[PDB]
Write a protein that holds these residues in place. Sequence first.
Motif, PDB file in Angstrom:
ATOM      1  N   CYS A   8       0.636  -1.141  -0.092  1.00 50.42           N
ATOM      2  CA  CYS A   8      -0.174   0.016  -0.029  1.00 50.42           C
ATOM      3  C   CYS A   8       0.994   1.036  -0.140  1.00 50.42           C
ATOM      4  O   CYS A   8       2.112   1.050   0.041  1.00 50.42           O
TER       5      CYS A   8
ATOM      6  N   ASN B  83     -18.365  -0.476   6.522  1.00 53.56           N
ATOM      7  CA  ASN B  83     -18.028   0.579   5.739  1.00 53.56           C
ATOM      8  C   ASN B  83     -16.619   1.083   5.694  1.00 53.56           C
ATOM      9  O   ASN B  83     -16.290   2.350   4.882  1.00 53.56           O
ATOM     10  N   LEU B  84     -15.662   0.588   6.527  1.00 56.00           N
ATOM     11  CA  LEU B  84     -14.222   1.089   6.818  1.00 56.00           C
ATOM     12  C   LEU B  84     -14.130   2.554   7.336  1.00 56.00           C
ATOM     13  O   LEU B  84     -13.339   3.501   7.095  1.00 56.00           O
TER      14      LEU B  84
ATOM     15  N   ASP C 146      -8.757   9.007 -10.518  1.00 52.22           N
ATOM     16  CA  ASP C 146      -9.186   8.314  -9.328  1.00 52.22           C
ATOM     17  C   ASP C 146      -7.911   7.591  -8.558  1.00 52.22           C
ATOM     18  O   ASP C 146      -7.103   7.309  -9.282  1.00 52.22           O
TER      19      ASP C 146
ATOM     20  N   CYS D  90      -6.902   3.788  -6.880  1.00 56.63           N
ATOM     21  CA  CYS D  90      -7.281   2.456  -7.194  1.00 56.63           C
ATOM     22  C   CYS D  90      -6.681   1.525  -6.101  1.00 56.63           C
ATOM     23  O   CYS D  90      -5.932   1.760  -5.217  1.00 56.63           O
ATOM     24  N   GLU D  91      -6.833   0.237  -6.439  1.00 55.98           N
ATOM     25  CA  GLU D  91      -6.303  -0.933  -5.440  1.00 55.98           C
ATOM     26  C   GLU D  91      -4.657  -0.741  -5.451  1.00 55.98           C
ATOM     27  O   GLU D  91      -4.096  -0.306  -6.562  1.00 55.98           O
TER      28      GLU D  91
ATOM     29  N   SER E  55      -4.233   2.629  -1.468  1.00 55.39           N
ATOM     30  CA  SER E  55      -4.884   2.928   0.015  1.00 55.39           C
ATOM     31  C   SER E  55      -3.827   3.062   0.815  1.00 55.39           C
ATOM     32  O   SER E  55      -2.591   2.786   0.635  1.00 55.39           O
TER      33      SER E  55
ATOM     34  N   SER F 102      -9.008   5.383   1.046  1.00 52.75           N
ATOM     35  CA  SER F 102      -9.537   4.462   1.734  1.00 52.75           C
ATOM     36  C   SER F 102     -10.287   3.277   0.901  1.00 52.75           C
ATOM     37  O   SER F 102     -10.108   2.127   1.118  1.00 52.75           O
TER      38      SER F 102
ATOM     39  N   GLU G 156     -15.243   1.979  -5.366  1.00 51.82           N
ATOM     40  CA  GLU G 156     -16.222   1.105  -6.319  1.00 51.82           C
ATOM     41  C   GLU G 156     -15.729   0.811  -7.477  1.00 51.82           C
ATOM     42  O   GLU G 156     -15.839   1.826  -8.252  1.00 51.82           O
ATOM     43  N   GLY G 157     -14.830  -0.087  -8.014  1.00 50.38           N
ATOM     44  CA  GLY G 157     -14.017  -0.205  -9.092  1.00 50.38           C
ATOM     45  C   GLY G 157     -12.900   1.138  -9.042  1.00 50.38           C
ATOM     46  O   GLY G 157     -13.003   1.620  -8.032  1.00 50.38           O
TER      47      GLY G 157
ATOM     48  N   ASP H  96     -12.162   4.713 -11.087  1.00 47.60           N
ATOM     49  CA  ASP H  96     -12.366   5.875 -11.822  1.00 47.60           C
ATOM     50  C   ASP H  96     -13.690   5.689 -12.855  1.00 47.60           C
ATOM     51  O   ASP H  96     -13.722   5.848 -14.275  1.00 47.60           O
TER      52      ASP H  96
ATOM     53  N   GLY I 199     -13.900   8.184  -5.648  1.00 46.90           N
ATOM     54  CA  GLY I 199     -13.383   7.445  -4.650  1.00 46.90           C
ATOM     55  C   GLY I 199     -13.418   7.997  -3.246  1.00 46.90           C
ATOM     56  O   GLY I 199     -13.535   9.223  -3.111  1.00 46.90           O
ATOM     57  N   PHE I 200     -13.226   7.042  -2.099  1.00 43.31           N
ATOM     58  CA  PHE I 200     -13.356   7.685  -0.986  1.00 43.31           C
ATOM     59  C   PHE I 200     -12.093   7.732  -0.160  1.00 43.31           C
ATOM     60  O   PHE I 200     -11.076   7.163  -0.196  1.00 43.31           O
TER      61      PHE I 200
HETATM   62  C1  LIG Z   1      -6.628  -0.810   0.166  1.00 43.28           C
HETATM   63  C2  LIG Z   1      -6.810   0.043  -0.671  1.00 43.28           C
HETATM   64  O1  LIG Z   1      -5.972  -0.195  -1.612  1.00 43.28           O
HETATM   65  C3  LIG Z   1      -8.397   0.188  -1.567  1.00 43.28           C
HETATM   66  C4  LIG Z   1      -8.473   1.624  -2.168  1.00 43.28           C
HETATM   67  C5  LIG Z   1      -9.447   1.386  -3.475  1.00 43.28           C
HETATM   68  C6  LIG Z   1      -9.665   2.928  -4.189  1.00 43.28           C
HETATM   69  N1  LIG Z   1     -11.008   2.886  -4.926  1.00 43.28           N
HETATM   70  C7  LIG Z   1     -11.096   4.090  -5.787  1.00 43.28           C
HETATM   71  N2  LIG Z   1     -11.726   3.859  -6.908  1.00 43.28           N
HETATM   72  N3  LIG Z   1     -10.765   5.236  -5.249  1.00 43.28           N
HETATM   73  N4  LIG Z   1      -9.258  -0.018  -0.536  1.00 43.28           N
HETATM   74  C8  LIG Z   1     -10.090  -1.118  -1.046  1.00 43.28           C
HETATM   75  O2  LIG Z   1     -10.160  -1.821  -1.739  1.00 43.28           O
HETATM   76  C9  LIG Z   1     -10.984  -1.246   0.288  1.00 43.28           C
HETATM   77  C10 LIG Z   1     -10.695  -2.174   1.350  1.00 43.28           C
HETATM   78  C11 LIG Z   1     -11.696  -3.118   1.530  1.00 43.28           C
HETATM   79  C12 LIG Z   1     -12.497  -3.261   0.260  1.00 43.28           C
HETATM   80  N5  LIG Z   1     -12.489  -1.969  -0.451  1.00 43.28           N
HETATM   81  C13 LIG Z   1     -13.104  -1.485  -1.358  1.00 43.28           C
HETATM   82  O3  LIG Z   1     -12.739  -0.275  -1.841  1.00 43.28           O
HETATM   83  C14 LIG Z   1     -14.422  -1.918  -1.837  1.00 43.28           C
HETATM   84  N6  LIG Z   1     -14.149  -2.009  -3.377  1.00 43.28           N
HETATM   85  C15 LIG Z   1     -15.591  -1.377  -1.401  1.00 43.28           C
HETATM   86  C16 LIG Z   1     -15.664  -1.673   0.213  1.00 43.28           C
HETATM   87  C17 LIG Z   1     -15.957  -2.801   0.638  1.00 43.28           C
HETATM   88  C18 LIG Z   1     -16.145  -2.880   2.129  1.00 43.28           C
HETATM   89  C19 LIG Z   1     -16.218  -1.773   3.142  1.00 43.28           C
HETATM   90  C20 LIG Z   1     -16.057  -0.409   2.287  1.00 43.28           C
HETATM   91  C21 LIG Z   1     -15.670  -0.276   0.836  1.00 43.28           C
END
Ligand SMILES: *C[C@@](*)(O)[C@H](CCCNC(N)=[NH2+])NC(=O)[C@@H]1CCCN1C(=O)[C@H](N)Cc1ccccc1
Lengths: 249, 27
Positions: A28, A95-96, A191, A193-194, A197, A218, A221-222, A224, A230-231
């Motif tokens: 991360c 909800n994290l 946005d 992405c994975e 975080s 944090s 959903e997907g 961008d 994104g949150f």
């Molecule tokens: C751990 C991080 O890398 C990652 C950031 C993703 C950002 N997405 C965008 N489009 N800005 N976080 C996550 O992947 C988090 C951790 C747990 C699951 N998750 C999600 O984003 C899920 N896609 C949605 C979600 C699931 C459970 C609780 C809250 C959100």
Amino acid sequence: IVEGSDAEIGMSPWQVMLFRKSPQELLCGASLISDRWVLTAAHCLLYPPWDKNFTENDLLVRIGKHSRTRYERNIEKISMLEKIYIHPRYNWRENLDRDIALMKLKKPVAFSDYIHPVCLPDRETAASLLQAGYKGRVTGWGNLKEGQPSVLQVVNLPIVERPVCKDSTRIRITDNMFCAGYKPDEGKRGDACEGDSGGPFVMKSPFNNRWYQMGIVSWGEGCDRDGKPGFYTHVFRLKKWIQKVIDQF
Amino acid sequence: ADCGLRPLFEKKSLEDKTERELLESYI
Ligand SMILES: *C[C@@](*)(O)[C@H](CCCNC(N)=[NH2+])NC(=O)[C@@H]1CCCN1C(=O)[C@H](N)Cc1ccccc1
């Protein structure tokens, strides 16, 4: 980071990379807030649904790192973790909410032209800077699409009005979070992405020329997707916790 | 404290290529 641009050298000196010690694996993003404290997202360390629950000994951190390939010798620094602290009311089940963690470095990192801490917002800096339409900057080494870059990726995004963020998702959103992103009809995209975080959402203070970390990547959903901003963890709302951890008494 | 100021940018009184987009968003 989706639809971002390569980072200029030294443009995000507080940037931190969280790696699994063995085998070596980028986990991360993170950020330097003092010469011994690193701020990240809690889910980067603890997330049961993904079989995640790391301990200090399992991880390491890299600072001042410009290439994931090359090893800028007297530029990048590697530090082990002394202790990990995860927000006590971190809600990974629903909800994290309070997706924030602090990692105390074993030994202090010396500041350089390539490594410097970002400022944490005070009450009035947050009051004025946290406004819908105002833009912040997100940085990360995570995926470029819903692999990842060889250089740090950067993207500037507008803060979205709470009512819009709330309507954009079924997840129960809280005051301890905020969303940022472009409108579908507006041209530009962008946005996190994975893999991103833990990384910082920063803003430059027009008052003192300083960069302040307003949020932590944090979730989303997907990546961008139209209508899916994104949150981010709302750093200022969680400052009292950060204080009690860094200033235990 | 020593934070938010980058040696290669603010300390050199040099802006990065996109920080104007941020300042402009404040207006
Ligand atoms: C751990 C991080 O890398 C990652 C950031 C993703 C950002 N997405 C965008 N489009 N800005 N976080 C996550 O992947 C988090 C951790 C747990 C699951 N998750 C999600 O984003 C899920 N896609 C949605 C979600 C699931 C459970 C609780 C809250 C959100």
